[PDB]
Amino acid sequence: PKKRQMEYLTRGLIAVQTEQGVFVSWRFLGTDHETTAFHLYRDGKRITRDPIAESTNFLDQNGTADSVYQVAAVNKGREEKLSKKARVWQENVLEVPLAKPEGGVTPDGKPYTYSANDASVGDIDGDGEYEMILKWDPSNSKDNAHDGYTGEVLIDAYKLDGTFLWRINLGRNIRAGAHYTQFMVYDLDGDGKAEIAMKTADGTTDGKGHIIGDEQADFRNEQGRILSGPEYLTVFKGETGEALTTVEYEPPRGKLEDWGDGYGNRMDRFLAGTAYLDGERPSLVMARGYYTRTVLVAYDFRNGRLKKRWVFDSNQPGHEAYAGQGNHSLSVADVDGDGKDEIIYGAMAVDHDGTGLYSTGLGHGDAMHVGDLDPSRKGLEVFQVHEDATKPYGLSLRDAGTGEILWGVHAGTDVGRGMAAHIDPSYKGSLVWGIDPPGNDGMSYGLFTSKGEKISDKAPSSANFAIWWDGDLVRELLDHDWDGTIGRPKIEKWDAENGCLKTIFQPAGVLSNNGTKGNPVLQANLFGDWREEVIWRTEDSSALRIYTTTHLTRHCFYTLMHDPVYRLGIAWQNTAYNQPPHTSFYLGTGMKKPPKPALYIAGS
Ligand SMILES: [Ca+2]
Ligand SMILES: [Ca+2]
Ligand SMILES: [Ca+2]
Ligand SMILES: [Ca+2]
Ligand SMILES: [Ca+2]
Ligand SMILES: [Ca+2]
Ligand SMILES: [Ca+2]
Ligand SMILES: [Ca+2]
Ligand SMILES: [Ca+2]
C-alpha cells in the first residue's frame, strides 16, 4: 500500500486519579512496531517489570496525587527515550479556559451573546500535540430559510494548557449558521504544521488583524442574508491565524435562481473535507450545494498557494442524476481499493479524480456512516437515512464502492436520525437503526443487523454519535437529553439482553451544542489510548471540558488519529450537521487483526 502523510504525535501520556489508584494511558503510534511494548516509570523509577504489550493503559494502585509518570517504548529488548513527565489529573477532566467574546447588537437593535460551538484539531506548531480550533456561535445564528441578522463568526486557536493563540473574525459578510462556515484544519502542504481553510469575504480579519478586501463593504440585505459581493476562500497559518493565500470561492453564485430559489437557501449549503485524492498527500475539498446543483472543488496547497485540482459539477454532461443526493455531511474513504480517497457525498459518490463514482438516486439525508459495517462482506459499506418521503427508502445499506443497495427499508416519511455501530457483541459488525430526532413524533424505524435482519421494531433511542468510551470492543452511544431549550450531554450503553439504553456518563455543568442536534464541541481520540475523548462547553462557555476514560481495557489499537478514515472524520466533524467518525477497519467483537497504518510522518 501507498504510505500516507500523517501527523507526528508524542506518546500523549496522561494520568488520572481514580478511587482505585491512578489510571495511566498513552498512544500506540503508527510508527511503532506491532511487537513494541512499554515500560512505565513513576517518580523516575520503573514500576513495570515485564513490558506492557497487550494494551497502552495501566492502573497504578500505588499512584498518588503527587505522582509523575513517564513511558518508554521497548523494541527487541532495547528501551527507547522516556516520554515527557505527566502529572496526575484530579478528575477525568481537562479544563481549557476560553477567552469568551463579548456579545453585541445586530443592525436591528437585537442583542446576542456567544457560546462555544463546533471545534476541530490540528498541531499548529509541529510538537506532536493537538491545538483546539474553536468556532464561536452567536445566539442569533440562522437556518438558511429563516430571516434575520447574525452576529459575526469567530474562530479561535487554543493550546490544551489554556493558552489563547489567536482569533479570526469572519466579519459582517459571512452569515452565522450550521450551513455557512465549514472550517478545515489539516497540514495540507506537509510541513508538519496544520493550517485552516474556510470561506471568507470582504471584512474578514485574520489572526494578526489584517483585513481581507474592503473593510467598509456591507453586503447584508434587509433580511440579514448575504447574496451579493465577492466570495473568497482563504488558507490561514495555524500558528498565527494569518492569511497565507486568498482566492475566489468556487463555484460563484452566478444567477441566484439557477440554484433553485432566489433567496440562497439551496445555494448557501456548504460542506468541506480533506481527502487523499492521490493516496499519498491531502487535498482540500470545498463543496457547494446538495438539494439541486451540486459542486465539489478539489485543491492542493503547496508553497503558499492553492491550486485547483478538479471540479465535479452535477450540471456537467452525464452528472445530472448526482443532484439532490448530498447530505448535511460528507464522508471520505478509499472505497474501491485503489489506495486513493473517494468522497461519499451523502447518497452519491465522487471518484478520486473528480468523475462521478455513482449516484444511488435515494436522495438527501441527515445522517450517514461509512465504515466496515458488515465485516463478512469485502470492502466498506454505507448506512444512511433519507429525508424525501417520496423515495424508496427511509434507511439504506449499500456497498460503499459500487453503490449497490444491499437492502433498504421504506418509510414514506423523513427519517431524521440514523446510526451504525457495533452495539451487540452477538453480531459481528454494526447494528443499524433509524429514529425521529427530538421534538418530533418519537418514531422508531427499526433496529437491524448490517445484513438486514430485523432485531426489533423499537430501536435504541439514541442516534447521534457513537463513541468508544469504556474498555470493551462494543461502541457506546453519545447524545443528550433535550428539554426544548438546552441539552444535557450523556454517554449511554446498549443492553442487548433486555433492549434498553443505560446511562454510563453524564457530566454536570456542561451543555450540548446546536439545539436538538446535541453535538459535543468535539469527539476525538486526542490523547491517551485508543478510546475517544469528548469535549463539551461549560454552561457559560467560560471553558471547554475535555473528558477522558478511566475504564481499563485489555485491547490494543494504533491511535485512531493514525487511521486513514478516522483522522479524516475528525477533520469533517464540524461540517454542517456534525457526524461521528469511523475506523477504516472493523473494530468490534470477532474482529481480525487490523492492518498497521501505512504512513510517513510529515516534516520528517
Ligand atoms: Ca502543538
Ligand atoms: Ca502545513
Ligand atoms: Ca479509492
Ligand atoms: Ca478511485
Ligand atoms: Ca436534511
Ligand atoms: Ca465490509
Ligand atoms: Ca466499549
Ligand atoms: Ca484516548
Ligand atoms: Ca456543524
Curated annotation (Swiss-Prot):
Ca(2+) 1 binds at D118, N574, A576, N578. Keywords: Calcium, Cell wall biogenesis/degradation, Lyase, Metal-binding, Repeat, Secreted. It is found in: Secreted. Induction: Up-regulated by growth on type I rhamnogalacturonan. Optimum pH is 8.5. Ca(2+) 9 binds at F527, D529, R531, E533. Divalent metal cations. Has highest activity with Mn(2+), followed by Zn(2+) and Co(2+). Its EC number is 4.2.2.24. Pectinolytic enzyme that degrades type I rhamnogalacturonan from plant cell walls and releases disaccharide products. Degrades rhamnogalacturonan, polygalacturonic acid and pectic acid. Has very low activity on pectin. This is Rhamnogalacturonan exolyase YesX. It comes from Bacillus subtilis (strain 168). The lineage of its organism: Bacteria, Bacillati, Bacillota, Bacilli, Bacillales. The gene is yesX.
